[PDB]
Every structure is written in structure tokens, then in C-alpha cells.
Amino acid sequence: HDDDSCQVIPVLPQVMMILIPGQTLPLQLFHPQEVSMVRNLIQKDRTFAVLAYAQFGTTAEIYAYREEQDFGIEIVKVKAIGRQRFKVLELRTQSDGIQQAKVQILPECVLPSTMSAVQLESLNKCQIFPSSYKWWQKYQKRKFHCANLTSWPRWLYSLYDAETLMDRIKKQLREWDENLKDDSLPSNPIDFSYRVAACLPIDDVLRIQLLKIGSAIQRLRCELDIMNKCTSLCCKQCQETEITTKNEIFSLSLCGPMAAYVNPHGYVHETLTVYKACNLNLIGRPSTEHSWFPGYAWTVAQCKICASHIGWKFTATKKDMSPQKFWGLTRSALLPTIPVILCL
């Protein structure tokens, strides 16, 4: 039906992002080619293709549709969410310019418990777990008790157990944002993986590899690897300027560490709040207009080597505030590095 199936979906021509499933994209359609497209789309499935350049991408489902004729042109304003990754097969460019795409739906491998086949029948009843850290030593003794019947030990079976992985990820996430450790993140592995990938400070090529990973467990196991191996963040361009390091990430507000903020011109800036940054030159004089973190004053910050924008250096206006100097670094500019292969 849908998984591992070859469909054709139209392509928003002006697009490029690596759309991680579950992310949302705002959209403003001016040219009549794309306006007639979304018109057909919302009449039909309203799922279009976000080409992730190259031969991959993610289908995006329109969930908000608004035509607000303004400035004497039929502007259609839409919002979509990312559903399923895909590998392109054939791109056919229509006469209108709207490109159509034969598409192979990438896989989302749902997998049973590692102990589903070895679980002893008598032991099947004593499984449902009754609703600190000794709990996880006990969790591991119980769930993987039947591992003694196999040729591998319990602690290996835990390195592939979705529930154990998701907690290891969520604990490290807690060092960045001491905050909601519950509804904040999802409960299904398939969603929890795609959520972690969209709120990690990773570059587009790491996103793209997590997106190509088939099973949600392999995707978690890798997300855990990135959080353990790629602990130094560098300049994406000159690739020779360590900016910050994993232990300096915090979360100034309750919205995350690397939340997404909007400048007064609609540019979005996943900005990873860190405590200390290095090898950054400050461009201009501090300002507080449109300051995303009220009470701090922003100063543009670029690389000391290639002068490529990295973020801002936010300064405490008052004296009560703590911290007083932090730095905001846009995700676009960073690149994770291992101070060695990422595994799955």
C-alpha cells in the first residue's frame, strides 16, 4: 500500500531542505504554476515531495491551507508536515515547470522485542512490568532473562532494545535542558528517533544518514553514537575552527537547547544555546532590538578564519541575570566532529 511502494507525487519546485519526518514547513506560493499545484494537491492527497538534494527526500502532507489575496496577486499560504522518506526514481519536468517524481517509499522497520522468540511460556506471564537506576538493572535482569538460552549476554540485548536506547538518549538530553522528561519527547521508537534527529545540533549530512537508516532501533543506536562521538562542533565552511563542545550546551529557556527562532524578516535560526564559544569574532555593536532572549543583547559572531556567520554573542543587559555571557549558534553553521565511524 504505502511502505516500499512506488508512487508519483508532485514536487514543490523551489525547495531544498532536508525535511525530517514530523518537522513542519511554512510555505508561501506566488507564481501561478505552484498556485495551481497546491490547488490540485489539496483537492487530492495534498502530499507533495520535498527533494533533499540528489535522489532522496521526504513527502510532506499539507495540514493548513489559506488563500489570502494580498498585494494584487493570488498568494496561497500553506503549511505541511513531513511524513515518509523516499528515494526518487524518475524526475519528469512538466510544461508548467512543476516537476513530478516516481518515488520509492523508504522503509520504517517495525521490530518485535529481542526476546519475543526466546521468551519461555511460563515466563510470559511474569513479564508485564509493574508501573531511580536500580530499576534499569532490574529491568534488564527481567526482560532479557531468557537470554541465557541464547549465545549472547543480556547487556548485548540491551544495546538493541528500543526502550533502553530511548532512555539513554533522554538522559543525555536532560543534561542540556533540565526540564520536562516525559510528554516532551514521544513514546513510540519510530517517532522518538525522528524527533531526536530534528533537535540534535547536527549538520545536514548527519540528518541525511539518520534519514536513510531503515529501522528505528538502528536510528536510535546511531543518534546515540553522534551524541557520544561528535562532541565537538566546528565551522561548517573552513572546517578548521572548533567553536563549542557538548558539555557547554545548556537551555536558556524551557523551549530546548537548540530551539528555532525567527528574525524580523522571517529567517529561521535553529540556535543552540551554549555557555562558552571559542574562535569567534564579534561584528558590530551589541543591540537588543528583536532580541530572542529578552534581557540579553545580541552581537553578530563570525568565524575568526573564514568570516562565515556562526551566530550571536548575547550579553546581559542587567546585573541580576545569570548567566551574563552566553552564545547562540545557528545549526546551519556548525559541523559535528570526533576529537572513527558512526555505527547502527
Binding site: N263, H265, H290, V300, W312
Partner: peptide, 26 residues
């Protein structure tokens, strides 16, 4: 005003410099 960067907000003294900054975003 004609010297502020739309993307990061940097206000240069000269337009002929804000153009050199404009490169740095791609």
C-alpha cells in the same frame, strides 16, 4: 538601514561591505 543584513542583523557602515558579508551566507 540599507546596511543591515537581512539574515543575521549585522549593520555595516558601507553597503559595499554588507555585500561582502552577503557572500558569507552561502
Amino acid at each position: 538601514s540599507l546596511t543591515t543584513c537581512e539574515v543575521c542583523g549585522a549593520c555595516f557602515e558601507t553597503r559595499k561591505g554588507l555585500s561582502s558579508h552577503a557572500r558569507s551566507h552561502l
